[PDB]
Design a protein around this ligand. Sequence first.
Ligand code: QEX
Ligand code: QEX
Ligand code: CL
Lengths: 305, 305
Amino acid sequence: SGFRKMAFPSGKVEGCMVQVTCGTTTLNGLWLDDVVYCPRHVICTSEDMLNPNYEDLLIRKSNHNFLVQAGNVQLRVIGHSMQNCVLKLKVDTANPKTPKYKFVRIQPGQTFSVLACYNGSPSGVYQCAMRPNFTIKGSFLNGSCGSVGFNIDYDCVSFCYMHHMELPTGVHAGTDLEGNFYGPFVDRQTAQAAGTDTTITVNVLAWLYAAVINGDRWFLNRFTTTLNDFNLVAMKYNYEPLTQDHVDILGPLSAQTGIAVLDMCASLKELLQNGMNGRTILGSALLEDEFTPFDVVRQCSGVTF
Amino acid sequence: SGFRKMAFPSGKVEGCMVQVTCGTTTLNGLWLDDVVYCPRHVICTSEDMLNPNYEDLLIRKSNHNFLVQAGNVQLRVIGHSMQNCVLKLKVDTANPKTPKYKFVRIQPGQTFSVLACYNGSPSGVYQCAMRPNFTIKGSFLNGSCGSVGFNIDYDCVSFCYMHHMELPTGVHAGTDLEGNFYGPFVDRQTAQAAGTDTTITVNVLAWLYAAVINGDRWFLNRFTTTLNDFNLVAMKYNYEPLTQDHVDILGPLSAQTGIAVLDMCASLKELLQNGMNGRTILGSALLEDEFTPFDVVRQCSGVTF
Ligand SMILES: Cc1cccc(CC(=O)Nc2cncc3ccccc23)c1
Ligand SMILES: Cc1cccc(CC(=O)Nc2cncc3ccccc23)c1
Ligand SMILES: [Cl-]
């Protein structure tokens, strides 16, 4: 029993965290095999960040301008290249602690663990979700650039995020490990406002199923809804549209609890309408949306309570 | 910016997790140097749990009855002993991944990271606090016994918890690494329950300071209170008594924000008597009490390990 916001064990990632320095700028890098992946803005000054020409800033650099530090051992850069907004620094030594890894681009709603790092040194590990507006509600201070997001299913580390910046609203923007930004964001100091955020409906539903598995049934009702009628109500509370793909993805949880997806949809409709009335669902007074259907099956028991 | 429930990087602990098997029972063990620490109930059957004489059950065991597995390598047990409710299995090989460590007994209100494991394999990591009633609100399934709680103090892993059982309310009970249970619990299948829990007042205040640091000031007011008047209000709302030691521990946060401790108490008193009035503090509709003053300073300053 119990339901916690659970992050993957960070050990496989900690062993990849290095410090990258280009002049006055110091951030984090991910050392996998003989390559160090880091944000390309490491080559910029604060003046450069307004309208940077990365190709022009990078052409003025040599391998020895990049200082890479893996703990108290300096790595020697033998090559450099840029792939979108990520700087790939070829080093003279392959990371002996390189785990089995893949680079995955995740979709909004998908969750991951973040190993927050400062000066190539892991500070903490937390869970978060890729918001529908493509930002993440992270916990990051200056020097956290290059900290990564990942999932570890079946002993393999799937890198999905590299932190690049903090937007004016306190939320964070970053890229996949191939340098492609999530969302309409750029690595420039310009008017980039996070678009209006919405609640991840499939996740809230998954968490309601987690609550049923853990014994909470107070929010359930005798009603059902059509998928279309649920959407018309949900969009009014700034909830993401629930699609047929989400209904299918919730199938196993629906079969485990005996509560059909559109019956759990009626519960969410009522919950949005009435609020909690002084009650909590899995220790929360809010409808939690940073647990995916996959996370619920991962964490929760196979036997319903 | 951002404030997440953050656990310590689990890597130093992951390298110590092994699988312990005694007959039909399989749980987790902590392998530090040449000793594997695990719950002593590993030697018991389900009929034994009703009334176990651990010394008598253990005297009937030999070293080879204990199967220890560190990944896909079997460790050979060369000795065994008991220290309170922990089984210390002397093994032939010392853990090469043994980090700098101490065994610390924590007090209620203190938080720690839990590396949940199944079959000696780390599954996830989360942050939790030792409740004033000495239970932990963990997330554990069958097979999680032997999972550990820890904090990192610079380079030193301070082991503070080993998981032993789940109480009828879904909350968890365990011991320090010397086998001494936290709370009035015994390691036996008998009627046991969690005493009425209280809210960790110093931790709620610390999280209000975190909210102020992160830009939330709606709950602040022009008022102050005496420590004694605040304690009358705290006793009414099932909050732990706030002491002069807690007031001193909150000093740095008080100086950083400019909000005196008794000034933040007057904000807490207003939230307890009136509620939040439809608002949230750091994305929560409840007053969060699982962040210590040190956790707030560590996450808002970026300490590394
Ligand atoms: C691409 C880009 C453009 C301009 C400036 C930057 C630096 C940046 O955003 N750094 C930070 C990253 N995360 C959290 C931060 C919190 C406080 C201060 C700085 C933070 C990056
Ligand atoms: C000392 C003791 C007495 C009686 C029973 C036990 C076993 C026990 O409670 N194990 C578990 C621990 N955490 C989560 C569990 C979830 C489901 C089932 C079992 C779980 C221990
Ligand atoms: Cl006994």
